[PDB]
Amino acid sequence: KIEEGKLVIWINGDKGYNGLAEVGKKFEKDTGIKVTVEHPDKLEEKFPQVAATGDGPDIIFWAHDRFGGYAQSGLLAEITPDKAFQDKLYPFTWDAVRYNGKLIAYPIAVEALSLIYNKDLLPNPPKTWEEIPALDKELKAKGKSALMFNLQEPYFTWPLIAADGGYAFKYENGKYDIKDVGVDNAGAKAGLTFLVDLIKNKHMNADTDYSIAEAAFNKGETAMTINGPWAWSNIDTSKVNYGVTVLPTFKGQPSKPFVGVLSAGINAASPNKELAKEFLENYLLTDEGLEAVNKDKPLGAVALKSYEEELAKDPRIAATMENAQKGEIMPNIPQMSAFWYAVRTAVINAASGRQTVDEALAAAQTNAAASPTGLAGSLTNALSNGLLSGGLLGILENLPLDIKVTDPQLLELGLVQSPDGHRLYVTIPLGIKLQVNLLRLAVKLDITAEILAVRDKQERIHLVLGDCTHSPGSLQISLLDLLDSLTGILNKVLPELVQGNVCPLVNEVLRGLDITLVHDIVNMLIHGLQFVIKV
Numbered sequence: 001k002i003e004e005g006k007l008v009i010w011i012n013g014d015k016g017y018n019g020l021a022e023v024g025k026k027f028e029k030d031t032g033i034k035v036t037v038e039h040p041d042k043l044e045e046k047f048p049q050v051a052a053t054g055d056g057p058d059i060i061f062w063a064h065d066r067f068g069g070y071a072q073s074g075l076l077a078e079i080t081p082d083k084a085f086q087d088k089l090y091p092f093t094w095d096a097v098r099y100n101g102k103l104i105a106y107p108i109a110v111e112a113l114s115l116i117y118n119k120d121l122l123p124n125p126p127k128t129w130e131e132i133p134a135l136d137k138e139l140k141a142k143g144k145s146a147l148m149f150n151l152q153e154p155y156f157t158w159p160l161i162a163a164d165g166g167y168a169f170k171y172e173n174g175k176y177d178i179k180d181v182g183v184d185n186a187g188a189k190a191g192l193t194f195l196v197d198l199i200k201n202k203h204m205n206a207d208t209d210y211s212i213a214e215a216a217f218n219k220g221e222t223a224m225t226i227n228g229p230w231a232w233s234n235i236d237t238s239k240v241n242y243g244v245t246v247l248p249t250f251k252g253q254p255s256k257p258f259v260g261v262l263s264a265g266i267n268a269a270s271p272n273k274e275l276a277k278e279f280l281e282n283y284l285l286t287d288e289g290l291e292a293v294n295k296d297k298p299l300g301a302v303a304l305k306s307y308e309e310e311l312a313k314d315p316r317i318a319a320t321m322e323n324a325q326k327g328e329i330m331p332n333i334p335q336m337s338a339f340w341y342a343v344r345t346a347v348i349n350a351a352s353g354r355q356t357v358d359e360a361l362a363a364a365q366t367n368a369a370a371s372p373t374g375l376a377g378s379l380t381n382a383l384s385n386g387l388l389s390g391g392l393l394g395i396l397e398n399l400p401l402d403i404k405v406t407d408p409q410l411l412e413l414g415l416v417q418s419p420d421g422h423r424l425y426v427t428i429p430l431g432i433k434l435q436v437n438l439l440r441l442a443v444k445l446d447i448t449a450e451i452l453a454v455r456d457k458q459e460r461i462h463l464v465l466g467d468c469t470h471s472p473g474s475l476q477i478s479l480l481d482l483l484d485s486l487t488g489i490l491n492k493v494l495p496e497l498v499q500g501n502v503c504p505l506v507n508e509v510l511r512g513l514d515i516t517l518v519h520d521i522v523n524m525l526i527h528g529l530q531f532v533i534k535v
């Protein structure tokens, strides 16, 4: 049903689709190839539905955060722009479109929250959150407010909360580590505590939401609000004389708003991928293409350096790009769904006083990471937690020999499935510090173990530990702030002393697993199906 020899494009109705149509027109003129631009309602749920059947548009436009999901589900083609082309766009925008080290879409535009202020009430807006309480005091005396913005959505409260070391999921080269969330830290505790205080001191109301803050600002009741470029046109109407600027710092740290990147993906089912590439690279992403779209409906800041340079002559667009640069690319993976919820709850519970800052944050810090995985992730999670509660840290710390062993860690477990699918091998990295105190060392080494499915007498079928031993090359010693003497020794002592105090624990942990996880794993090993991801 996808036609070869033309291009169908889907983009949201609040974007500049007519302008984009004009781009398609120039394209047809040069190449003769026809371009159709549609804006179906709920295109973001429609694309995965139709694309999964091998139908849909050749190119889908949408915020980059969905694209991760689409990639996992095989819906998106890898895009192949040359480095010369890549130089044309800001690097961080290319990071918004990475999935597993690959480019999955073309960045188009960028948006982030900014501080929006009323120039008649507040000609010189504050550079720090801390000076807001004092400013609210003055203004109430003049019968007005310092600051009003939506506290109902964690999107709006996140810039403050995450200002010091906060993050959603840790980014590593196109990959997010879904087990590593940054919601809870001193930064987050301070930021959220500050917000809650502003509510206790009546500088804000806990029940303030988008509509209330928008009205209050657009009616000139409050001096400041926090919002994005989509809000601008309503203020243009309001006649309020406004400016848009960098978000205030908290404890000298920049605010850390989430960054959305409007992006263009190519349908993995499209017969037109090369034409799509040609259209996107040579037609749409140019001063001219972007101009067409922007004049139809404004893009805000854009990913194309040349055109962004023009737009940023507009100080609000410039401010938007500045807040983006200081901000956090929204993770492009579906687990964000748990994150939002975890965080939403926490904030609402904190501002209502239903929970303390620390408890809301601690719950959230746990729940954001709690999305269930398939067998491989479940197994490695289960094994790690098992070893930890089985007291493996103690076993390391209390390893015998002047010396003090410290900082025992379980590292990230590895997993390998036999090519035939019938066999399974676990790598358990372990670490400790040695104090020769003076002369501190970091030791790391692996224990590898086989996991086996075994029927015994007869229909009884179980999951048992194969050979549990040190990994031969694995031992690595590292100076911290003699050897090869020490290491020379540790090579012939350590691996055996570790593996002997451990393999038994590994053996108990295997048995302590959820019984259905065990049955499903066994069931797949028997029939030799691969649930394990090549790394």
Ligand SMILES: [Mg+2]
Pocket: 090, 091, 092, 093
């Ligand atoms: Mg950059």
